[PDB]
Amino acid sequence: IQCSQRMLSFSDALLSIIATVMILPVTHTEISPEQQFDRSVQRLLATRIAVYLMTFLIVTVAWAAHTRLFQVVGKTDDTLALLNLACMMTITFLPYTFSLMVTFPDVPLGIFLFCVCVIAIGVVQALIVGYAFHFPHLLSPQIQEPLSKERVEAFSDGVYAIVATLLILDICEDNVPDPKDVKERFSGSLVAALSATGPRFLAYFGSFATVGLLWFAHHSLFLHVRKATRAMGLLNTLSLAFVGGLPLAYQQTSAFARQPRDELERVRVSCTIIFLASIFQLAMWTTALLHQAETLQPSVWFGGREHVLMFAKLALYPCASLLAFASTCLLSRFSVGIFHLMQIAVPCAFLLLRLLVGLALATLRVL
Amino acid sequence: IQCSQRMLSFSDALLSIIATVMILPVTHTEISPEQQFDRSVQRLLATRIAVYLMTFLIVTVAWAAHTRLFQVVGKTDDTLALLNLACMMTITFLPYTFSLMVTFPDVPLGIFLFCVCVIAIGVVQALIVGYAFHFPHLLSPQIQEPLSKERVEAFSDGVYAIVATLLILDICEDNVPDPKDVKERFSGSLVAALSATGPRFLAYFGSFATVGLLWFAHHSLFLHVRKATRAMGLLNTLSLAFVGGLPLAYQQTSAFARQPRDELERVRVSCTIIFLASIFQLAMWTTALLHQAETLQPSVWFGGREHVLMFAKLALYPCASLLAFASTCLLSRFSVGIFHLMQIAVPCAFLLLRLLVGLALATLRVL
Ligand SMILES: [K+]
Ligand SMILES: [K+]
Ligand SMILES: [K+]
Ligand SMILES: [K+]
Ligand SMILES: [K+]
Predict the structure, then answer these.
(1) Across the interface, which of A9, A99, A162 has its CB nearest the CB of B157?
(2) A68 closest CA partner among A125, A2, A118
(3) Residues annotated as region Short helix H2-1 (chains A, B)?
């Protein structure tokens, strides 16, 4: 009998990467002035967005089934490990079945291979169940509906890491020039080029800061979580689905970004994505506050020491993005600058969150 | 005081992905008959290969420094978590500095920004050390040279997962056709197309099986490892570096694959990569057998129950790849078929490894 921790971690990594890499087609969508107000391509963009959403949700359902199964298994074996690898192999093909369905929705091939993949996952999981039940020692101690916190955390970490990787790759592929366009830039000089490249580098830092602070909020929340509800699982799945779309909000090479659009509505889109990624973490926290006793640790209960701190940590980004959107709709003038300033202010607020919360609540105290 | 497990797992995931995604430039290298025997582009391919190797090794050195640091830290904090995120952000930029150096090696800009990134990583880690030492409770229990097995395992898992993702993405982007080339294929019929697409799908299954079986061997080895040596760490780093090159051996869209080359030498290249990825795992095992007492569990010691099983598990792929290369050099006729057959036989051998080993050693016993 062997421990199953590492195998499940590998499965979580693979599944998270598979669910998150469906955003690349969306980033690669190209609209330029040839189709400025073309309806077909403009709705094609939303088509690809929705396709990404559904593929992510399907892969997440598969991951949840895997979690429920290896909650029952408990201890792994060589045969069980190879069967798990087969299941991973079958799951990895679902994105391809969707990728064949997108181009020819009416012709039934994609239908056929998608159903085949699903039924194959089913038979593989059933074989795992049978092999485990045949040998008692391979079953869980209790058998021999909460989700597992470790698997949720691993999936979330994988998604966030893949997002950051996408950002850095965008930068690396855009900015790096080659010679003759270099000396068409300047006196064969790449220092002038470099500082003509600086805002791009610093934008990368800003986007990575956004993603890392969202991960920090999720990590702080789940450090204080005793048990993970199914509702919290759904809300985390939605939060991660909208986190996967952050590259679309922060990218330069992406043919999505290279399209005719004003600064104000790009700010609106980015703030929409950020708000949707954050409000679901806040919703997880609110839902857990419903039965703290089973879902939360005593420190963050109503009237606890770190209750206000956690609430502020989770409500920082929602409020900032919402007020930036409100600036877009209200001011009409200083919106892009307000977005830039928010991307700078939120990190420092996270760094000095404790002092801010303390002095703020004292102020509210005596006045 | 908070637990540092999840933060370190996230760091490992990010670093593994960053180290492994440098292979994409190598896959995207394009050579076609315009430059059939051009020396410049042919050596440019090896240039990009070496660049990938060095970038991987540098990122691995950074990851090892991070491991050594948070071996001393032990318990994390909000400030320490944000500083760790800053360190990750700084490390993610190293691939970009190399990406700017590749195009202009002589101009000193890449030099400058690479040195700046390294010194920034240094100051961030020094600040973490100082903040930790200032507060005793944030230090390790003992302080208040073996590597950590958990971090090694996480890094390896990330690398393998990224490789599998690259493979599936290759398939998805190549094969999916669009309409007018569909009905240029056939009677507007995508079933004929599909079975004109089948060898590609099944090649994906084969490559994923290769990667998953290598991961299975690594997992079985490290399940029986009590302590991880520095030499074992170096050998694992080399094994992972050559594992990252498996997509180059198994890919179809990659402009690397779409170049003039015979089947025999492509087989040779793939078998070379596989042998280099496997011999280093076998070397880790041999090195650990030098001081089993501290590095290995009793079950796999000389004369143990699972000693022969582990040796066979780790020597399966090396011998198969070596004999396929030997077929290429000797037979000259049946080499490609032998490679295809090996890609089928090795998995089943892994599935029936125990029975094979048992009956083989009994045979050798009485005869
Ligand atoms: K884990
Ligand atoms: K991961
Ligand atoms: K881990
Ligand atoms: K990983
Ligand atoms: K990628």
Answers:
(1) A9
(2) A125
(3) 36-42
- Of A2, A92, A216, which is closest to B85 when you measure between CB atoms? A216
Residues in chain B closer than 8 A to A15 (CB atoms): none
- CA quadruple A333, A335, A336, A339: dihedral, nearest 10: 160
Distance CA B297, CA B295 (A): 7
Q: What single letter denotes the amino acid at residue B71? A: Q
Q: Does A250 touch chain B (CB under 8 A)?
A: no
Cα B79 from Cα A350, distance rounded (Å): 9
Helix (H, G, I), strand (E, B) or coil at B147: strand
Q: How many CB pairs under 8 A join A and B?
A: 164
Q: Evaluate whether A73 touches A125 at the Cβ level (below 8 Å).
A: no
Judge whether A44 is closer than 8 Å to chain B, CB to CB.
no
DSSP letter (8 states) at residue B296? B
Q: What is the number of other CB atoms lying within 10 angstroms of the CB of residue A93?
A: 24
- Start-end of H helices in chain A: 5-20, 24-27, 39-73, 78-92, 94-103, 109-134, 149-175, 179-185, 190-195, 198-223, 230-243, 246-249, 263-288, 292-295, 307-330, 335-351, 353-366
Query: Which residue's entry shows tokens 């076998």?
Result: B282
Q: Which residue of A has its CA nearest to B97?
A: A172
Residues B4/B81, Cβ–Cβ less than 8 Å: no
H-type alpha helices, chain B? 5-20, 24-27, 39-73, 78-92, 94-103, 109-134, 149-175, 179-185, 190-195, 198-223, 230-243, 246-249, 263-288, 292-295, 307-330, 335-351, 353-366
Resolution of this PDB entry, in A?
3.0
Q: Secondary structure of B68-131 in the HEC alphabet?
A: HHHHHHCCECHHHHHHHHHHHHHHHCHHHHHHHHHHCCCCCHHHHHHHHHHHHHHHHHHHHHHH
Q: Among residues A264, A279, A261, A274, which one has the least CA distance to residue A333? A: A264
Lookup: tokens for B66: 């991070």
Rounded CA separation A231/A283 (Å): 10
Specify the 3-state DSSP secondary structure of B330.
helix
Angstrom distance (rounded) from CA A265 to CA A21: 25
A2 chain-B contacts, CB cut-off 8 A: 223
Q: Which two tokens stand for residue A72?
A: 């029952």
Residue B273 CB partners (closer than 8 Å, separation 6+)? B242, B245, B246, B248, B249
Instruction: Tell me if chain A has a CB within 8 Å of the CB of B131.
Output: no
Of all ligands present, the nearest one to the C-alpha of B156 is: 4
Q: What distance in angstroms lies between residue A157's CA and the mean position of ligand 1's atoms?
A: 9
**Which phi and psi (to 5°) does residue A254 adopt?**
-45, 120
Three-state secondary structure call for residue B2: strand
Experimental approach was cryo-EM
CA A285 – CA A283 distance, rounded (Å): 5
Distance CA B17, CA B123 (A): 24
